[PDB]
């Protein structure tokens, strides 16, 4: 996360522009109706 | 002659139901409870050590204890036995610390002996600081674990009846009509139902044949296959349903084909639905209908077909749904043509980042070759995490009257859109596409709106133009 001191073209007011660059977040895969556990209990839905 | 006998078999097949699936799940829950108990005891110890440090000076060093002493609290519950339920209640001992006030004291207990297992009596071992000494320390390392319940993990029965065959034959005799229908149902362990209806008559319509077989097997899951066929002069019914469960995957298919033989109105329709799920469900939906119409007495005839195809894909990566339909028909009425053809394409897309949906329409139709060109009632929309865009009701229309002096009017909107992005707000709108015509040169219109905002760079343009009869008006407003 950066901060730039800028004088915009569209705006006559000088500015400090705090910019958060784009971020890509990796959501891990997961299993579904095969056997589900969330750290509290494990259930075999196929067995059910 | 009517027969409704039944060779009675009152026996059943009792399939044991495996509750063991729950018996392990509860154990997993207890494991989680035990680790959470460890964590909670850690959190409590964080306070208890400091509390002991605080108390030490007051109690151990200073004379503030061991005066008017009280005997430790120990409560004993004598054992018991219940012959009717066959339960042996072992003695239960509960201890509290007499010093201080009712502070907990260590206790351990086994479980009682019972007949059958609907509930398991909880055996526990609880160790907690005792106030009989100033020393306080929590055994985080000894977590409490209750006995997981085994509620007769394998004592319960799924009932598959052993019923005998159900027989019912109906037979009547007469010179002009003869009916003989037989329905047979087999229920040894699976289901096999067959029907036969036989009708014979001097009259053509009263003579026909109907056959039906339905077969369901349960030994390895429910797998059904139903096929029906009708033999009638005016109706030709073919119906095919088969739901199969191969113990892992799910198959559904509907193949129905039947057509009507009415002279003046001959019809044919056809059904296809095959929902399949190997890993990700896949569904096919194609509906086809045909109709042939002709009314000689009314001198009105029309033919067409309304057919639809839906594609559905619920993939884990993304979800795509595609649908389009075509309402088609042509006909003539009193020597004047009836025109109708409706086409639509509906398209929707979804995803974690972007979703889109654009549906296109063509209402093109006309009566007696009059009032034509119903066109382009379309829209388009897109939404992405980065930006937003929209285009809503751009259209075009032109309808002509074929009576009088051929007055025309096809008023409609022009395209107009919206685009949104960070730091930028842009809105452009063009509208009022009109059709002048006779009777004093009907209105001709149009309107342009431009908005573009960049904070302090704000530019706005507006324009209107109006033309009518022998006069016209144009207005312009600009803000830069």
Curated annotation (Swiss-Prot), chain B:
Annotated spans, Heparin-binding: 1-65, 212-345
Positions of the UniProt region annotated as LDL receptor binding: 202-222
The record's induction entry says: Up-regulated in response to enterovirus 71 (EV71) infection (at protein level).
Its recorded name reads: Apolipoprotein B-100
Organism of origin? Homo sapiens (Human)
General function of this protein: Apolipoprotein B is a major protein constituent of chylomicrons (apo B-48), LDL (apo B-100) and VLDL (apo B-100). Apo B-100 functions as a recognition signal for the cellular binding and internalization of LDL particles by the apoB/E receptor.
Query: Glycosylated residues?
Result: 53, 165, 187, 240, 294
- What pairs make up the disulfide bonds? 23-153
Positions where Phosphoserine occurs in the chain: 108
Disease field? Hypobetalipoproteinemia, familial, 1: A disorder of lipid metabolism characterized by less than 5th percentile age- and sex-specific levels of low density lipoproteins, and dietary fat malabsorption. Clinical presentation may vary from no symptoms to severe gastrointestinal and neurological dysfunction similar to abetalipoproteinemia. Hypercholesterolemia, familial, 2: A form of hypercholesterolemia, a disorder of lipoprotein metabolism characterized by elevated serum low-density lipoprotein (LDL) cholesterol levels, which result in excess deposition of cholesterol in tissues and leads to xanthelasma, xanthomas, accelerated atherosclerosis and increased risk of premature coronary heart disease. FHCL2 inheritance is autosomal dominant.
Q: Where in the cell is it found?
A: Cytoplasm; Secreted; Lipid droplet
Output the superkingdom of the source species: Eukaryota
* Post-translational note: Palmitoylated; structural requirement for proper assembly of the hydrophobic core of the lipoprotein particle.
Q: Region Basic (possible receptor binding region): which residues?
A: 3-13, 215-223
* Quaternary organization: Interacts with PCSK9. Interacts with MTTP. Interacts with AUP1. Interacts with CIDEB.
Q: Which gene encodes it?
A: APOB
């Amino acid at each position: 996360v950066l901060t730039k001191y800028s004088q915009p073209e569209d705006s006559l007011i000088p500015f400090f522009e705090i910019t958060v660059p784009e971020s890509q977040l990796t959501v891990s895969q997961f299993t579904l109706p095969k056997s589900v556990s969330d750290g509290i209990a494990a259930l075999d839905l196929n067995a059910v | 002659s009517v027969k409704a006998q039944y060779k009675k078999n009152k026996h059943r097949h009792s399939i044991t139901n495996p509750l063991a699936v729950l018996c392990e799940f509860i154990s997993q829950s207890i494991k989680s409870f035990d680790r959470h108990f460890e964590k909670n005891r850690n959190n409590a110890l964080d306070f208890v050590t400091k509390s002991y440090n605080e108390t030490k000076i007051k109690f151990d060093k200073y004379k503030a204890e061991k005066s008017h002493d009280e005997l430790p609290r120990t409560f004993q519950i004598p054992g018991y036995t219940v012959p009717v339920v066959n339960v042996e209640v072992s003695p239960f001992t509960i201890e509290m610390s007499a010093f201080g006030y009712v502070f907990p004291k260590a206790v351990s207990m086994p479980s009682f002996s019972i007949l059958g297992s609907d509930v398991r009596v909880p055996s526990y071992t609880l160790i907690l600081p005792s106030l009989e000494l100033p020393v306080l320390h929590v055994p985080r390392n000894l977590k409490l674990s209750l006995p997981d319940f085994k509620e007769l993990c394998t004592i319960s029965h799924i009932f598959i009846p052993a019923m005998g065959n159900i027989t019912y034959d109906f037979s009547f005799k007469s010179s002009v009509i003869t009916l003989n229908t037989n329905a047979e149902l087999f229920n040894q362990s699976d289901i096999v139902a067959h029907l036969l209806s036989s009708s014979s008559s001097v009259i053509d319509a009263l003579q026909y044949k109907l056959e039906g077989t339905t077969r369901l097997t349960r030994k390895r899951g429910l797998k059904l296959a139903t096929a029906l066929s009708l033999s009638n002069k005016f109706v030709e019914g073919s119906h095919n349903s088969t739901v199969s469960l191969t113990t892992k995957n799910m198959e559904v298919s509907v193949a129905t084909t039947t057509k009507a033989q009415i002279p003046i109105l001959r019809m044919n329709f056809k059904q296809e639905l095959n929902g399949n799920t190997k890993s990700k469900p896949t569904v096919s939906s194609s509906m086809e209908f045909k109709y042939d119409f002709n009314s000689s007495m009314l001198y009105s005839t029309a033919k067409g077909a309304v057919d639809h195809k839906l594609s559905l894909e619920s993939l884990t990566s993304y979800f795509s749904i595609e649908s389009s339909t075509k309402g088609d028909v042509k006909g003539s009425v009193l020597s004047r043509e009836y025109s109708g053809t409706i086409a639509s394409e509906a398209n929707t897309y979804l995803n974690s980042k972007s979703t889109r949906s654009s549906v296109k329409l063509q209402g093109t139709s006309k009566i007696d070759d009059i009032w034509n060109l119903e066109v382009k009632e379309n829209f388009a929309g897109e939404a992405t995490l980065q930006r937003i865009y929209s285009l809503w009701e751009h259209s075009t229309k032109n309808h002509l009257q074929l009576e009088g002096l051929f007055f025309t009017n096809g008023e409609h909107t022009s395209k107009a859109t919206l685009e949104l992005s960070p730091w930028q707000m842009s809105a452009l709108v063009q509208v009022h596409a009109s059709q002048p015509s006779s009777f004093h040169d009907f209105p001709d219109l149009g309107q342009e709106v431009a908005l573009n905002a960049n904070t302090k760079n704000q530019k706005i343009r507006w324009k209107n133009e109006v033309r009518i009869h022998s006069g016209s008006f144009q207005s312009q407003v600009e803000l830069s």
